């Protein structure tokens, strides 16, 4: 019911007095009610995860994809609340970016896939430079555009070779073709590396990162998370190459070393940009699997909630700095937020549990993300890639704990006299409380996805 | 399929070795999207009626919006329309 | 001298905070020629090197998989 929402509120932004801080309240509550009254498709979802196909080219996989779009709706509700409560007229293209991402998580066939990845990429190119009175965003948007164009024709050249070897298009027609003509394998790894532009696999590495630091913080939350889940959710929904046949494992080896060897960083945005890169590199390891999606579906949410959480926490930490950076981007250095525990240390507690999330101390997240990841690995037998994932987790934990160790040393001179800034506090408290109480209901989901 | 791979590869490594003129890079990236259609159309001709040529009319209609967003974003590679700067 | 050895054990941990602190500058110095302006050209030549090295290493793979120096020379950078 997103298309109706888009065509409604593009008419609503038309003939508006450029107040433009109310329309997001309407979009937030509309997506909230749509999720609340559209969760009733979960009963008709799965008897044995029975797929349902729109017109032969679009697929609805009711256990996987019906959870993915619910996560999309959830993080969109969070972003829409984050803009409420500095803005231009933009939520129309937020929603159509969502439309493209949900198409690629529902795309059975490559025509829908290519249309929707390019629609999605155009949305990213636009959102990067809506804040056009920047010199950061002006450079970053054009860089993102040119390389998205290269990676777009890489997509289309992979699929055009795929059409050149087989007159069909659907991966439904791949149907365990076990004679496995070798160019089918090479086409498929080319399509894999094409879709893997967004994760910034270590030869495609640096270019995303300057873009992430050259957007405003209200934007880099949105596009360190949307295509991160989108293209990979496509990539796990259809398991292109059962194993790597050493092509992709090399990409993640040089990634999960060569992006965690990017340790010394003083810029905040670079730091958690590498975080969101390497934790996206994690879930590439079970792109190397077959018949395994539970670890992936759980790891998306039990990563992305916390990614959203740490961005919302360093949003809240602008108020306490006694210096700011540029008009669009407040807090880029780690050493800006030094004595934060002598400020409202409950958010320091939240920042603590969401960074201990990312290092994966057991009783909240890591024994339920990384445990499922490691059981999916060692089910297959990738014994070496286990220990390099462990090395990646330790060295990632080092710059993760860099944030907490700079977070709570000692303040120079700041305690307390203020007014309040709240009513979005329940959002950050909801993400932090769902982060550190998932150990309660960590078995109910184990049954529910066993029945889907 | 020599005819499309050669124009694709030359547009591609023109986009690599482009140490002059941002817009020549931009139009080489454009001409990639017509180096790919000479592959796609002759594969469809060697096969059949409309199976891949539907994707061809899709990539034409979308390559338009590619160049549109690329221009309307290249306008904002700077300040806007024109002011004092350096 | 047993204590002097026990500091050689910190020489198995000090460099984990030092050889990684050379790996960081080595990883951040590569593809950082211009790095404020002109950042398109670095990345474009880089993804050319990506597709060339990766297709060439697929060719290296399916002739003699024992030849595993082409990754180990890439670890010489970081």
């Amino acid at each position: 019911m997103l298309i109706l929402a888009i065509i409604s509120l593009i008419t609503f932004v038309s003939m508006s007095k450029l107040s433009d801080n109310r329309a997001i309240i309407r979009l937030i509550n509309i997506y909230l009610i749509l999720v609340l009254v559209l969760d009733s498709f979960l009963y008709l979802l799965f008897l044995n995860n029975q797929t349902y196909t729109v017109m032969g080219e679009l697929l609805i996989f009711n256990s996987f994809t019906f959870y993915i779009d619910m996560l999309i709706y959830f993080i969109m509700i969070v972003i829409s609340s984050l803009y409420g409560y500095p803005k231009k007229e933009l939520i129309i293209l937020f929603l159509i970016n969502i439309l493209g991402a949900l198409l690629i998580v529902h795309s059975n066939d490559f025509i829908t896939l290519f249309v929707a990845i390019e629609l999605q990429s155009y949305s990213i190119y636009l959102i990067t430079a809506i804040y056009n009175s920047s010199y950061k965003a002006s450079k970053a948007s054009m860089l993102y555009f040119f390389m998205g164009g290269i990676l777009s024709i890489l997509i289309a050249y992979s699929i055009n070779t795929y059409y050149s070897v087989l007159n069909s298009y659907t991966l439904h027609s791949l149907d365990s073709l076990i004679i496995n003509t070798l160019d089918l394998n090479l086409i498929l790894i080319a399509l894999s590396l094409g879709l893997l532009f967004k994760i910034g696999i270590a030869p495609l590495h640096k270019w995303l990162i300057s873009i992430y630091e050259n957007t405003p913080i209200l934007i880099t939350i949105y596009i360190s998370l949307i295509p991160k889940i989108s293209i990979l959710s496509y990539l796990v929904l259809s398991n292109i190459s059962i194993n790597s046949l050493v092509i992709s494992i090399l990409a993640i080896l040089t990634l999960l070393v060569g992006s965690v060897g990017g340790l010394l960083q003083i810029k905040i945005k670079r730091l958690l940009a590498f975080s969101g890169l390497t934790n996206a590199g994690y879930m590439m390891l079970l792109l190397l699997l077959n018949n395994n999606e539970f670890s992936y579906l759980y790891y998306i949410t039990q990563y992305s909630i916390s990614h959203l959480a740490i961005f919302m926490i360093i949003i809240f930490s602008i108020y306490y700095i006694n210096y700011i950076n540029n008009q669009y981007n407040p807090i880029i250095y780690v050493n800006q937020l030094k004595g934060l525990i002598h400020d409202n240390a409950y958010l320091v507690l939240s920042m603590a549990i969401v960074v201990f999330s990312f290092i994966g101390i057991p009783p909240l997240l890591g024994f339920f993300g990384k445990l499922n990841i490691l059981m999916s690995i060692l089910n297959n037998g990738y014994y070496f890639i286990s220990i390099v994932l462990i090395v990646a987790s330790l060295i990632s934990a080092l710059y993760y704990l860099y944030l907490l160790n700079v977070s709570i040393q000692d303040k120079n001179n700041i305690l307390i006299n203020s007014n309040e800034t709240v009513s979005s506090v329940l959002s950050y408290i909801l993400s932090s409380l769902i982060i550190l109480i998932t150990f309660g209901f960590i078995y109910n989901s184990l049954i529910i996805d066993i029945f889907n | 399929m020599f005819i499309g791979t050669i124009i694709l590869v030359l547009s591609f490594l023109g986009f690599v070795f482009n140490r002059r003129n941002i817009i020549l890079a931009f139009i080489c990236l454009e001409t990639m999207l017509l180096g790919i259609n000479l592959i796609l159309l002759r594969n469809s001709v060697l096969f059949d009626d409309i199976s891949g040529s539907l994707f061809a009319i899709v990539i034409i209609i979308l390559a338009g919006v590619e160049s549109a967003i690329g221009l309307s974003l290249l306008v904002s590679y700077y300040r806007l329309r024109g002011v004092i700067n350096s | 001298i047993a204590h002097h050895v026990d500091k050689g054990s910190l020489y198995r941990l000090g460099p984990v905070g030092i050889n990684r602190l050379l790996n960081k500058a080595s990883y951040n110095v590569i593809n950082l020629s211009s790095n404020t302006r002109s950042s398109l050209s670095m990345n474009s030549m880089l993804i050319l090197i990506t597709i060339v090295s990766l297709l060439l290493l697929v060719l290296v793979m399916n002739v003699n998989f024992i030849i595993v120096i082409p990754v180990l020379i890439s670890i010489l950078y970081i």
Partner: peptide
């Protein structure tokens, strides 16, 4: 090691992946 910044002027220092030379100390129109 450690570095910090509270005053950024005479910008465009080349020898860095990303330096302390920011983008908006003052704008112009």
């Amino acid at each position: 090691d450690l570095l910090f910044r509270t005053s950024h002027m005479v910008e465009d220092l080349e020898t860095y992946d990303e330096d302390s030379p920011i983008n908006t100390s003052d704008a112009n129109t």
